[PDB]
Amino acid sequence: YRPRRFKEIEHTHGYVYRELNQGSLLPLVDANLKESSSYYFKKLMSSIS
Amino acid sequence: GEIIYDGGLSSKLADVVDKTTEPHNADGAVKDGRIAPVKLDLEKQKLDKL
Amino acid sequence: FALAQINADDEFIGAIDKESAEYLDEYATLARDISNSLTLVKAAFGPLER
């Protein structure tokens, strides 16, 4: 796979702002999930009809 | 005198599209029998449907 | 006794499930928000006392 080319002006004088922080889901995951699992499972079933 | 050769219809090797094109498979002398590329909505900056 | 038939033929385009792939990609956005929100609160409030 490869990206598509932009306009010629954007390749010569183009600048972009980007952030490199992917982060982690651990702070939300790291918990006692016994009580909230049932509520999560209900939402999981509704995602697919 | 009589004109034997004065220009004429000229063949072009290739045409060049001046507009940006969406990804596509071959649909000319070669036709691709596979499914067209699937367009997926990814890398959403703001959360939606989650 | 009454087991409903579940068909997901319309959901799959070849071997790609567009809806599932897009839903899973939103967790990457949530990961960025969790880390950024935690850092921003830490710098603004610092250690906490009760």
Side-chain angles (χ1 to χ4, degrees):
Chain A
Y1 288 78
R2 72 161 72 149
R4 207 189 35 201
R5 304 261 310 172
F6 296 74
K7 314 203 291 275
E8 295 85 357
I9 271 284
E10 323 197 340
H11 273 281
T12 278
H13 282 121
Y15 281 74
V16 78
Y17 177 88
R18 65 182 181 75
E19 263 156 12
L20 280 186
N21 186 50
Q22 322 214 34
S24 69
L25 274 193
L26 253 51
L28 176 68
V29 152
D30 167 29
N32 190 354
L33 281 168
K34 175 94 201 63
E35 271 304 328
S36 35
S37 63
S38 34
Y39 303 90
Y40 167 67
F41 288 150
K42 192 103 184 326
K43 195 34 180 29
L44 187 77
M45 305 309 156
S46 306
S47 318
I48 296 190
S49 45
Chain B
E2 177 251 342
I3 318 186
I4 289 176
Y5 173 74
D6 187 10
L9 199 80
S10 168
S11 314
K12 292 189 292 185
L13 177 83
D15 85 354
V16 189
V17 294
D18 317 304
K19 43 162 299 293
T20 178
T21 40
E22 281 298 296
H24 59 279
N25 283 338
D27 196 345
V30 180
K31 315 206 158 293
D32 190 38
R34 293 167 319 170
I35 308 153
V38 190
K39 171 155 183 152
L40 306 156
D41 289 345
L42 293 174
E43 293 195 350
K44 294 213 256 280
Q45 317 227 51
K46 211 166 316 323
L47 267 155
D48 163 55
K49 266 171 318 218
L50 162 44
Chain C
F1 195 61
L3 197 52
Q5 197 170 76
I6 308 206
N7 282 311
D9 209 15
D10 289 345
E11 308 293 297
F12 283 90
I13 312 197
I16 312 270
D17 189 288
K18 264 175 42 72
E19 295 302 320
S20 290
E22 291 156 10
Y23 186 88
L24 197 53
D25 208 32
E26 284 182 60
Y27 277 102
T29 311
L30 192 51
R32 193 164 319 232
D33 314 354
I34 288 175
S35 156
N36 290 339
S37 300
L38 274 154
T39 324
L40 248 175
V41 172
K42 224 207 157 186
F45 291 88
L48 300 156
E49 38 211 357
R50 204 182 98 245

